[PDB]
């Protein structure tokens, strides 16, 4: 650029642009115009008494809201010109924490002074890390209630213990009200970590819930959910999903007065019939003599533990031998392996993606071009403005069809959130999700086991399929979830747009959910082929030069003729093919490129396409508080 004053002018212009962007971003959150700053609080250790920190933290003006069990309140101050909504959550409670930490603007972790955190705190913190962290602030409780010689050493040991999870972060202690004011000032001005899934949809936290039943006997009525819009512009015609109770359509949006203004009845919209999205998760439209033989006629409680140990032995025999399945000597091999075919190479051999599809794909939806549709939908979300309710407004939502028990849950203490979806999201498809195993659990998990999924504001039980995470057209089925591999879970589910965090839990015992896997959502398509491989092994027992006689791979004569076009490979690296069967039993002649060792073993690979099971149901049981054994 040269000309020093012009270079400094360029730098000043870039400074002003970045300053304008930052100041525009920081005006949206926790103020006169924007929605209230939601702060969730988790005490990581059991020795921490949360109500002491809550009465220390409440004092501006407080408005003590209440529920059945939890006690969350509303904070307002014009000294900092800032508006807060403080909520509490207890670790181990998977339901409440994972359901309402996905809407909080700032999480406040509480740490006991002596030890870092409890085991339940570690489990909850792993779940929060895996689900997507908002801006987090670390805070401690019992530092000032110690002698000074112990105070300094306690802070040193605590900062040593924190470093394994939070690498470098400052700790703000809370014992006095002045320290609480400093912490409030810290939370008011923070570098916000923006979560994408919250930003691309229209989420809402239920500040008040009312129920108007149409009929008591039907147990069906209208919900009146009043709260602050925090995502995108809330549109009535879009569908609404409640995180634990499914997706369904809305009726009306009205705007009452704001009960909590920073510096102190009319309806907005009713739904049209045609423009409203239709709730349809699946497709609507479905001569010989008497005695002579043929040879001459040619001339003319503890059961679960036993199953668990059997699963351990199956996993041990699956890792030390990858996919070798024994040929049954009772059933013919061409009958039990009727649907299996041989591929010349797993990467390059052709396979039609629409060749033999089950009747379950006749019930799902596909995308002609998923990337283009996602880009167009996101462009219509960000670049376009819709006439719905803006963010920061206190609105009431009349939702037509809900069950009664949801309202009952809101009176038990469980938080309620509801988010407005993107178009073409209520439909069902086949999600492909990349997940790796958490080291916390070591339970063996087969392919089609029944697991609970937290896939980006959704919760559903399902039976996935596990595959290699490759770039090829074909992906081999993994019969077990390997610890260090990153695998792909493929299962029927309602379709959602990435980015989305994915959690895989397992119902262990007594309603205790065990986190077994975590990851994110890859591109969604049912065209991702999952291939189950079966390896048949045979023993070469007569070895000559370049050809051999092999037994025990089959047991009939026509079984060898059935699998003749499939080539054989060898554990010591030889490649060959079957020439001719000789015995009436499963003896066969095999030619190879080299000479086989006497220590050697021939084997062939057979391939089939496997499709996931349809075990989708949105109902998931409420977890008990988590505890170690």
């Amino acid at each position: 650029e040269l000309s020093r004053v012009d270079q400094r002018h360029r730098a000043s212009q870039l400074r002003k642009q970045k300053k304008e962007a930052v100041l525009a971003e920081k005006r949206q959150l926790g103020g006169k115009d924007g929605p209230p700053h939601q702060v969730l609080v988790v005490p990581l250790h059991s020795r921490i008494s949360l109500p002491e920190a809550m009465q220390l933290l409440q004092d501006g003006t407080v408005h003590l809201n209440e529920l059945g069990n939890t006690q969350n309140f509303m904070l307002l101050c014009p000294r900092l010109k800032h508006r807060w909504f403080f909520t509490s959550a207890r670790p181990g409670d998977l339901h409440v924490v994972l359901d309402m930490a996905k809407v909080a603007d700032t999480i406040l972790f509480l740490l006991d002074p002596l030890e870092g955190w409890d085991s339940t705190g570690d489990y909850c913190l792993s779940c929060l890390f895996a689900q997507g962290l908002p801006t987090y602030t670390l805070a401690v409780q019992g530092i000032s209630g110690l002698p000074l010689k112990k105070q300094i050493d306690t802070r040193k040991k605590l900062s040593k213990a924190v470093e394994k999870r939070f690498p470098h972060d400052k700790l703000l202690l809370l014992d006095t009200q002045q320290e609480a004011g400093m912490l409030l000032r810290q939370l008011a001005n923070q570098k916000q970590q923006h979560l994408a899934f919250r930003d691309r949809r229209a989420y809402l936290f239920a500040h008040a819930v009312d129920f108007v039943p149409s009929e008591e006997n039907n147990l069906v009525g209208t919900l009146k959910i009043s709260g602050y819009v925090r995502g995108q512009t809330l549109n009535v015609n879009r569908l609404l999903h409640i995180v634990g109770y499914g997706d369904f359509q809305m009726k009306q949006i009205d705007a009452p007065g704001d009960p909590f203004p920073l510096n102190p009845k009319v309806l907005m919209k009713a739904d049209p019939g045609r423009q409203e999205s239709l709730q349809a998760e699946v497709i609507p439209d479905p001569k010989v003599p008497k005695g002579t033989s043929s040879y001459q006629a040619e001339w003319i409680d503890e059961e679960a533990e036993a199953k668990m140990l059997e699963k351990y032995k199956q996993e041990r025999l699956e890792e030390m031998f990858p996919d070798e399945v024994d040929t049954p000597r009772d059933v013919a091999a061409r009958i039990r392996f009727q649907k299996y075919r041989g591929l010349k190479s797993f990467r390059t051999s052709p396979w039609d993606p629409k060749e033999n599809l089950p009747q379950d794909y006749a019930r799902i939806f596909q995308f002609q071009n998923f990337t283009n549709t996602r880009k167009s939908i996101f462009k219509e979300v960000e670049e376009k403005e819709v006439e719905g309710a803006e963010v920061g407004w206190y609105v009431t939502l009349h939702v037509s069809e809900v069950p009664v028990s949801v309202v009952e849950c809101f009176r038990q203490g469980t938080p309620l959130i509801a988010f407005s979806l993107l178009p073409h999201e209520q439909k069902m498809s086949v999600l492909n999700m990349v997940v790796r195993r958490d080291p916390g659990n070591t339970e063996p998990v087969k392919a089609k086991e029944e697991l609970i999924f937290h896939c980006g504001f959704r919760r559903f039980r399902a039976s996935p399929l596990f595959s290699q995470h490759t770039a090829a057209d074909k992906h081999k089925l993994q019969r077990f979830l390997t610890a260090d591999m990153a695998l792909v879970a493929t299962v029927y589910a309602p379709i959602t747009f990435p980015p989305a965090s994915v959690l895989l839990f397992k119902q262990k015992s007594n309603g205790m959910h065990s986190l077994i896997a975590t990851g994110h959502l890859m591109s969604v398509d049912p065209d991702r082929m999952v291939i189950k491989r079966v390896v048949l092994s045979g023993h070469p027992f007569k070895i000559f030069t370049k050809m051999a006689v092999v037994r025990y791979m089959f047991f009939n004569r026509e079984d060898v003729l059935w699998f003749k076009p499939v080539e054989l490979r060898t554990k010591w690296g030889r490649r060959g093919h079957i020439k001719e069967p000789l015995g009436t039993h499963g003896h066969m002649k095999c030619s190879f490129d080299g000479k086989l060792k006497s220590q050697d073993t021939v084997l062939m690979n057979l391939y089939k396409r496997v499709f996931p099971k349809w075990t989708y149901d949105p109902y998931v049981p409420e977890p008990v508080p988590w505890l170690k054994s």
Partner: peptide, 18 residues
């Protein structure tokens, strides 16, 4: 009748067009 199949192309899922 060894590694031969017919495999007719039926029951495809409905696709959302762009």
């Amino acid at each position: 009748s060894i590694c031969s199949t017919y495999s007719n192309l039926y029951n495809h899922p409905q696709l959302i067009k762009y």
